[PDB]
Amino acid sequence: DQIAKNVKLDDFIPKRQSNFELSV
Amino acid sequence: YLIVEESLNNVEIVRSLYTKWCSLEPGVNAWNSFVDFEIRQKNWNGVREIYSKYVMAHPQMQTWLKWVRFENRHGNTEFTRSVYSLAIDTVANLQNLQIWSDMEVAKLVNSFAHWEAAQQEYERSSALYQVAIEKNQLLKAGLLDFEKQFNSIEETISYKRKMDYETILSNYDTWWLYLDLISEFPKQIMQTFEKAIVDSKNVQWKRYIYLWMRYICYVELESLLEEELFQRLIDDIFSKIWLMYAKF
Amino acid sequence: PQLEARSGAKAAAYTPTGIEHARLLPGHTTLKYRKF
Amino acid sequence: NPEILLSLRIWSKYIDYLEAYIFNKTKMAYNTVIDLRPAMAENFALFLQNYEVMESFQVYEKTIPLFPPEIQYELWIEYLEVATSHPEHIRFLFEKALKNLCSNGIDCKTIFIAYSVFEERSKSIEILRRGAVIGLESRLQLWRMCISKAESVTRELYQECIQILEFVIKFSDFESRAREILAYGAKLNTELWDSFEIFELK
Amino acid sequence: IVNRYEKLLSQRPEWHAPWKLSRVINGHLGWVRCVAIDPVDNEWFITGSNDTTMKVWDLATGKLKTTLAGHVMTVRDVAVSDRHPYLFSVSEDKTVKCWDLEKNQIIRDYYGHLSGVRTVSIHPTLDLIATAGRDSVIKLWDMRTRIPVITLVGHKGPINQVQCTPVDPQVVSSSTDATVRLWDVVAGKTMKVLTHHKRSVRATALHPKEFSVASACTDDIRSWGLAEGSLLTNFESEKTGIINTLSINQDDVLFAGGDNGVLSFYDYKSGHKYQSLATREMVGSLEGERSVLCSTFDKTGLRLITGEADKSIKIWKQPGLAWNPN
């Protein structure tokens, strides 16, 4: 659980790949 | 870590760790290891879930096969069938090309068919193959195989058709073969024959003559058509053919 | 031998020395700018 | 259970007993054995007790599934048996077999010849030619077959053979244009010279 | 997963025009391993090299304006400033020099780097530059008082590109440790350490209008908004060469140069590679040499300038490729 907390899935995931109109 | 856990023989923690690992879209190898671990443990409740998760994470047909294999190893026949259906459903669902190769789907289909055959009811296999055909070469091959395993006449017909197609692709001998196939729906066959004739130096001429003869024979079996053929021949321009026409 | 090649350099921060380097001496205090 | 352990002989024995001896039951047993996993034996049984081709076909399919050199051989045997028993379907089967064993090593040429024969009973000739082209002893056999076919288009076949590969000399002899052939043979020979001399004389 | 792939398939990228070679200016007698343009104007662009020189170039003509001979060893990087008429340059002689452009002559050699200094970035807003070398440290300089103000310890190996943004994430380093860092100059520390690369991220560049920073290890071009310090996208850079350059265009047309010399272009944010360009070299030169070492666009964005190892500088003028993900 602790290990999981330490390293999360969304880190690996690019955020733009889902939403393109999304711009920083 | 896993090996340490195993050594210790505290298993809940190990399981948790495995779960954590598998949430990070890790390698197929990791998933396999997890599966193995699960198998080693007494319970077969949760293993299925993990397999499903793996499948979701790795859209790969080998994964599906592996899952099925586990099912087979397990006592339940229904479960395996269900799994197969799910696999098929998933493949169907993505119509858009977001997919493992069309060889893999075909393979899966074949496997399913085989399973069905092993089971009591064959109609199901046939249905599956029909479905496959509806949604290519590989699929056709699989269907043929299924038919062979098993309708027979239909399979034979299909094979013949395939052969004819191949011949056409390759393209006098081929033409002849095609004609034969057609002869062996009737209207369609006739049309095909006509097409072949249309398509159709000395050797070439001979072939053409043969085709003409065949056409004449067909007509006989079935006068205007014959006349038309004769006219065409004349335009193209033999003596023997003319004589035959006269006789007719 | 000790006539040897290498693997990596360095960058470690100590207390400053307070030495009056020649180049460090003031010069070009005025910075220029662009027009806009 | 098997995996855990990690019978066949017993099963085989049972099958044999059944064969010796109801027929339907025996067949079922055989099928079961196959599933668990001889093929030749099964085929023989089918031929004997059932006079049934379906069984033979099934056996052939099983053999194919099993798949190896021995398996290939078995399949070939089955095909031969089928042919003996009793066209398009047969041709298709032959083609499939060929595809399976493109360069098996053992008796590709023979297989090709068989196929040709079946066809005969132009296509055969074509098959022979193909074998000659796509296929040392085996190759030689194929060439011979092609030549035979030609003898039975022929010229074209001969030319093809020559291109693929002595062969030239043979072609020249067959022909006996002849002079040209002889010359060609010479360029790419004891009997060839003799032939040339003869030509000159005439 | 199927949920993401499908989404990706559904979404489409914009048709960026392709790129064709226009100008080639064989003038340097060495690699041309730096290139830069004026923020203010786009008349000239200078290019530091293994010559030791750096040469200035008029874009329109392609003609060599003038040379500058203020280094000993080879120039690794330069940076003309928007806010001042200074050109910073930096060479493996350990010198971060500063050329006035009113007189084309060095002024303030900044001293402090223990060894060969790889890159400069002038801060867009401050009167402060930032340099980093094989030192494994990125020092910031007060340009007036020509002293390193702060230094940034974090990294564990040589540090290549070190871009400066105007926000809080004021420096965007990029090492051979394959971390790319986001720093807080004011805190004297890191803020977020993007570790997502496998190898030496030997290229990185800030997006002009979009507050993000493409970065390139041996293959995978990541690109990220540095507000949080969070990944934005992964580009289709699957079997392309060792990415040397990673310039971004105004119109979201990220360029990547390789050690192969295969000029690869991509739509930015999409992560869609939409062109490859085969390199070229001179009849005398060898086929292994040709490789885009340094590159950058103009402020408009219609001309990409690539310094290639042919001792050349190639400027590039302008049906898109099909998608197909994994």
Q: Residue B172's Cα: distance from chain center in Å? A: 29
E230/A17 Cβ within 8 A: no
Question: Taking a C-beta distance cutoff of 8 angstroms, is the pair E180, E203 a contact?
Answer: no
Q: Can you tell me which residue has the tokens 């002595």?
A: D166
Alpha-carbon torsion (D182, D183, D189, D192), positive or negative: positive
Alpha carbons B18 and B170: distance in angstroms, whole number: 55
For B80, list phi and psi in degrees, rounded to 5.
-60, -45
Beta pairing, strands E163-164 & E117-122: unpaired
E137/C32 Cβ within 8 A: no
- In terms of CA atoms, which chain B residue is nearest residue E4? B98
Q: What is the CA radius of gyration of chain A?
A: 12
Edge-to-edge strand list for the sheet holding E292-297: E20-24, E312-317, E304-308, E292-297
Beta pairing, strands E213-216 & E272-277: unpaired
CB neighbour list of residue E234: distance below 8 Å, 6 or more residues apart: A14, A17, E220, E221, E222, E223, E271
**E127: closest CA of chain C, how far (Å):** 8
Question: Taking a C-beta distance cutoff of 8 angstroms, is the pair E76, E90 a contact?
Answer: yes
**A9: closest CA of chain B, how far (Å):** 6
Contacts of B25 in chain E (CB under 8 A): 1
Q: Is B49 exposed, middle or buried (0-12, 13-18, 19+ CB in 10 A)?
A: exposed
Name the maximum alpha-carbon separation found in chain E: 61
Question: Taking a C-beta distance cutoff of 8 angstroms, is the pair B102, B82 a contact?
Answer: no
Q: What single-letter DSSP state applies at residue A7?
A: S
**A12: closest CA of chain B, how far (Å):** 8
Helix (H) or strand (E) holding E306: strand E304-308
The letter for the amino acid at B75 is: G
List the subunits that have 3+ CB pairs under 8 angstroms with E: A, B, C
Establish if B163 touches chain D: CB-CB under 8 angstroms.
yes
E2/B98 Cβ within 8 A: yes
For residue D63, give the nearest of D112, D111, D23, D97 by alpha carbon. D97
List the subunits that have 3+ CB pairs under 8 angstroms with B: A, D, E
Question: Taking a C-beta distance cutoff of 8 angstroms, is the pair E287, E2 a contact?
Answer: no
Question: Three-state SS for E21?
Answer: strand
The letter for the amino acid at E291 is: S
Reported for D48-54, long-range contacts at CB under 8 A and 24+ positions apart, including other chains, are D49/D19, D49/D23, D50/D23, D53/D82, D53/D85, D53/D86
DSSP string, E233-300: EE-S-SS---EEE----TTSEEEEEESS--EEEEETTTTEEEEEE-----SSS-TTT--EEEEEE-SS
| The length of chain A, given as a count of residues | 24
Domain E1-326 has CATH 2.130.10.10: yes
Chains C and E contact (Cβ–Cβ under 8 Å for 3 or more pairs) = yes
Question: Taking a C-beta distance cutoff of 8 angstroms, is the pair E86, C32 a contact?
Answer: yes
For D146, list phi and psi in degrees, rounded to 5.
-60, -45
> Which residues make beta-bridge pairs with B2?
none
DSSP string, B40-83: HSS--SSHHHHHHHHHHHS--HHHHHHHHHHHHHSS-HHHHHHH
**E213: closest CA of chain A, how far (Å):** 11
Q: Is E182 exposed, middle or buried (0-12, 13-18, 19+ CB in 10 A)?
A: buried
Phi-psi region of E296 (alpha: psi -120 to 50; beta: other; left: phi over 0): beta
E9/B56 Cβ within 8 A: no
Q: What is the CA radius of gyration of chain D?
A: 24
Helix (H) or strand (E) holding E39: none
Q: Which two tokens stand for residue E186?
A: 């004011």
Helix (H) or strand (E) holding D167: helix D167-175
Size of interface B-E (CB pairs under 8 A): 17
Q: Which of E8, E196, E231 sits opposite A15 (nearest CB)?
A: E231
C10/E114 Cβ within 8 A: yes
Experimental approach was cryo-EM
Q: Which two tokens stand for residue D129?
A: 């030619």
E82/C8 Cβ within 8 A: no
Establish if C32 touches chain E: CB-CB under 8 angstroms.
yes
Parse chain E into domains and list their residue ranges. Answer: 1-326
CB neighbour list of residue D123: distance below 8 Å, 6 or more residues apart: B173, B177, D91, D116
Establish if B237 touches chain D: CB-CB under 8 angstroms.
no
Question: Three-state SS for C31?
Answer: coil
Alpha carbons E25 and E33: distance in angstroms, whole number: 14
Contacts of B14 in chain A (CB under 8 A): none
D91/B163 Cβ within 8 A: yes
